[PDB]
């Protein structure tokens, strides 16, 4: 295992995908032309996990860009680092998915998926030892949600022994494009429960609240939200991209984080998140990072971990700092928060330190939690779903594509089962 193949689908998927590539390219010292201009050998040691190396010492993201309309991908191509992507790796239709999961999954998306699979195969066939895949998409639209989950199923068929990882952006009425987002999300979660190994729940609700409440951005834009998302995606992939001992590949991460196969939905978190004004008063230190990363306010899913229990946790620190201090602070936080870690999985919090900090910070921390409190996210979606479904609002958009109600009922039930399962393990005891 070594190479990861990245896929980004739909508007949200391509927008956060592009930022992810901008951010990590900077971290690895790769410029927009794909040339290396860094100072540390750490930047190149594991560069092939994410980049192909071409002729002329060029590094090309192992990235595939997918959409059912040309607009976003055109903007990516024109954006920063837009020329870094392999032009043949842009696969797009013209008809769009109209914010309709069914069109993405069964109709328009189905017409396009084989040409996408052709590119996946070409990337995968050239891998020395393919680890698996990471997909970026929203669950609230049509393409990322419907076609993205279609792609997942088809890829799994051809690579059944490889790890499937997603960064899945959950919809929120605070940042809302359409009224059917709860339908699209529930149908999508239905797929994710069955067909991915690990999913980062990137919640627009949480991103909005961090921007508005913490960073005091009166009118957060998608740009503001995406800055947080790329900081998080940088953080949760540092163990894969830089030399290290813990969770160094997708499968070892899954083995540490997923005790039951369906419970693979992670709450990501980032520290520090303090406004410039408050930074005047509060020092950036290891204890500050540690307390912040375990606080609800720093989570990228709108769930309070103190309303549930942790099955497993990964904590990754970045920057120059005392290993002794990190260890003491991580012991301290587990002690003070003992009740909130399940007693029947011993030593379930793992800690790593990476020497290279994010751009513009002396140090940072990234949190990955598999917490039963994630049920709060799924319940929020479920409540919005049921309100619409009990009055059959807008179903004709989906039945018009050939689906029947029963499929809605099944996705609903599977997502409600997932919630009950989190609750079961939350309530379990060693005795």
């Amino acid at each position: 295992m070594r190479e990861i193949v990245h896929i980004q689908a739909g508007q949200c998927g391509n927008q956060i995908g592009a930022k992810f590539w901008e951010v990590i390219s900077d971290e690895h010292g790769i410029d927009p032309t794909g040339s290396y201009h860094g100072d540390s050998d750490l930047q190149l040691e594991r560069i092939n996990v994410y980049y192909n190396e071409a002729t002329g010492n060029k590094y090309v993201p192992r990235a595939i860009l997918v959409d059912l309309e040309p607009g976003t991908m055109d903007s990516v191509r024109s954006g920063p680092f837009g020329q870094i992507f392999r032009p043949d790796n842009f696969v797009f239709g013209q008809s769009g998915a109209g914010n309709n999961w069914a069109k993405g999954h069964y109709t328009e998306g189905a017409e396009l998926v084989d040409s996408v699979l052709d590119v996946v195969r070409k990337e995968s066939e050239s891998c020395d030892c393919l680890q698996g895949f990471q997909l970026t998409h929203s669950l609230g639209g049509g393409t990322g949600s419907g076609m993205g989950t279609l792609l997942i199923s088809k890829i799994r068929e051809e690579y059944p022994d490889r790890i499937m990882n997603t960064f899945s952006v959950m919809p929120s009425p605070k940042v809302s494009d359409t009224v059917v987002e709860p339908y699209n999300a529930t149908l999508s979660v239905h797929q994710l429960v069955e067909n991915t190994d690990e999913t980062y729940c990137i919640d627009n609700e949480a991103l909005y609240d961090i921007c508005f409440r913490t960073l005091k951005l009166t009118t957060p834009t998608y740009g503001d939200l995406n800055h947080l998302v790329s900081a998080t995606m940088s953080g949760v992939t540092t163990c894969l991209r830089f030399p290290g001992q813990l969770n160094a590949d997708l499968r070892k991460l899954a083995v540490n984080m997923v005790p039951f196969p369906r419970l693979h939905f992670f709450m990501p978190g980032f520290a520090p998140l303090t406004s410039r004004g408050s930074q005047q008063y509060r020092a950036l230190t290891v204890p500050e990072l540690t307390q912040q990363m375990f606080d609800s306010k720093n989570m990228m899913a709108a769930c309070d971990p103190r309303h549930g229990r942790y099955l497993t946790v990964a904590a990754i620190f970045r920057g120059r700092m005392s290993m002794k201090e990190v260890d003491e602070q991580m012991l301290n936080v587990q002690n003070k928060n003992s009740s909130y870690f399940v007693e029947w999985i011993p030593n379930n919090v793992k800690t790593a330190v990476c020497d290279i900090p994010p751009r513009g910070l002396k140090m940072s921390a990234t949190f990955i939690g598999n917490s039963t409190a994630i049920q709060e996210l799924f319940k929020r979606i479920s409540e919005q779903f049921t309100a619409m479904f009990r009055r059959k609002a807008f179903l004709h958009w989906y039945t018009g594509e050939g689906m029947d109600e029963m499929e809605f009922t099944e996705a609903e039930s599977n997502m409600n089962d997932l919630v009950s399962e989190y609750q079961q393990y939350q309530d379990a005891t060693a005795d």
């Binding site: 295992m1 030892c129 011993p346 060693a430």
Partner: protein
């Protein structure tokens, strides 16, 4: 004569191997290019050091060792590092994809693809021996390769070499440096599977070594490099009798006679002294009495447990350096009249002593002071079972909910294998209770 083949499996086994072989080269005057000026027989011989090193006609002294890992990055460092010329490339064996902290992948899914090649390479070493004594196998309990591949390899070595001796140095997990939540599953699975295939196993508790580094060497946050340098001194103490001659030298196999009273009761406790920094050792000569006393201090044990709360079935003292029997006997007499040393009623109480006169060595840039004399005690104590109890309890906590078990089942294992392994561990714990009870 009697050759010993070392097999270093997975990251821990390999990195500990690096430290051991570097230390052996320094002890024997072998350079990084494998040349040994003091050796006047070119291309072969039957010196004591030849138990661990073969020789080529061009004067290279080559470790009798295979390094194996299921991914390449740890062994790649050996291939490109300071002692790269020491090893023939075929002795360093890697796959592309590791076992992902999963015993099942190490023993079955991935391990099975490379096991025949590894055996072929081991056979090539064995064919060069005129009187092979056995194998020394270095591995973690916690890793997927260290656990699963080691087990598979031990099973296959029993088939291909019969009852030829197989000893283990096994790295027992500690939370300060562990990298997988499932290490207790892997540990129990490999301990169960290897138990009938191993003649003697020296467990090294990473937590014990971590705290010795912190406490006795003043290391704030020990790294694997710190741990492995200490571990190598201990392994060196144990193998010194195989690699050096001497009138008072006693072979490890003779200590083993006393250490293993029943086949399953084959886990000696090692305690090593002195572990001291240069700053503290300076102008301070630690005597035979002082280092011997230190062997009965639990803080110096390589496995955390309390022998004062168990019973002894054997006590062996392996001295190296400037040590004579008169001083050993005196130190032992003092200790007898002052320590919690109770034997079972069916074993003699005399301590078994060996002395190797070659003084201890240290690697440049290390943390240990260079000392004139050192000692490793190997004891067979019922207390070592506490280590199994701790692991067994962690296993039970997770297994009761079948946490993570799907990762193993997915790779073809059955729950039946988990319960069989855990029952065998419960029987081993009971075995250790039973041997300690007085005779009727």
């Amino acid at each position: 004569m009697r050759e010993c083949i070392s097999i270093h499996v997975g990251q821990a086994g390999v990195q500990i191997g690096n430290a051991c072989w570097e230390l052996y080269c320094l002890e024997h005057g072998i350079q990084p290019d494998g040349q040994m000026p003091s050796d006047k027989t070119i291309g072969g011989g039957d010196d004591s050091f030849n138990t661990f090193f073969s020789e080529t006609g061009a004067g290279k002294h080559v470790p009798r060792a295979v390094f194996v890992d299921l991914e390449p990055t740890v062994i790649d460092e050996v291939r490109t590092g300071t002692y790269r010329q020491l090893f023939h490339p075929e002795q360093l064996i890697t796959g592309k994809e590791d076992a992902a902290n999963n015993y099942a992948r190490g023993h079955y899914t991935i391990g099975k693809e490379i096991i025949d090649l590894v055996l072929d390479r081991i056979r090539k070493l064995a064919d060069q021996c005129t009187g092979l004594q056995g194998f020394l196998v270095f591995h973690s309990f916690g890793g997927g390769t260290g656990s699963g591949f080691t087990s598979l390899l031990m099973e296959r070595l029993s088939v291909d070499y019969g009852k030829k001796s197989k000893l283990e140095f096994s790295i027992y997990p500690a939370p300060q440096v562990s990298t997988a939540v499932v290490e207790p599953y892997n540990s129990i699975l490999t301990t169960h599977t290897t138990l009938e295939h191993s003649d003697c196993a020296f467990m090294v508790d990473n937590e014990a070594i971590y705290d010795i580094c912190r406490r006795n060497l003043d290391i704030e946050r020990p790294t694997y490099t710190n741990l492995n340098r200490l571990i190598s001194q201990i392994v060196s103490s144990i193998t010194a009798s195989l690699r050096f001659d001497g009138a008072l030298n006693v072979d490890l196999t003779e200590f083993q006679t006393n250490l293993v009273p029943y086949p399953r009761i084959h886990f000696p406790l090692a305690t090593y002294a002195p572990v001291i920094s240069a700053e503290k050792a300076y102008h301070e000569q630690l005597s035979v009495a002082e280092i011997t006393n230190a062997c009965f201090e639990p803080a110096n044990q390589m496995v955390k447990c309390d022998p004062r709360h168990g019973k002894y079935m054997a006590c062996c003292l392996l001295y190296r350096g400037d040590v004579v029997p008169k001083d050993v006997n005196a130190a032992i007499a003092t200790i007898k009249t002052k320590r919690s040393i109770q034997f079972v009623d069916w074993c003699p109480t005399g301590f078994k002593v060996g002395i190797n006169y070659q003084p201890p060595t240290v690697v440049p840039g290390g943390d240990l002071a260079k000392v004139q004399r050192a000692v490793c005690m190997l004891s067979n104590t019922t207390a070592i079972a506490e280590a199994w109890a701790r692991l067994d309890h962690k296993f039970d906590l997770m297994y009761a909910k079948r946490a993570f078990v799907h990762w193993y089942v997915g790779e073809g294992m059955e729950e039946g294998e988990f319960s069989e392994a855990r029952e065998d561990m419960a029987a081993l714990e009971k075995d250790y209770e039973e041997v300690g009870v007085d005779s009727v």
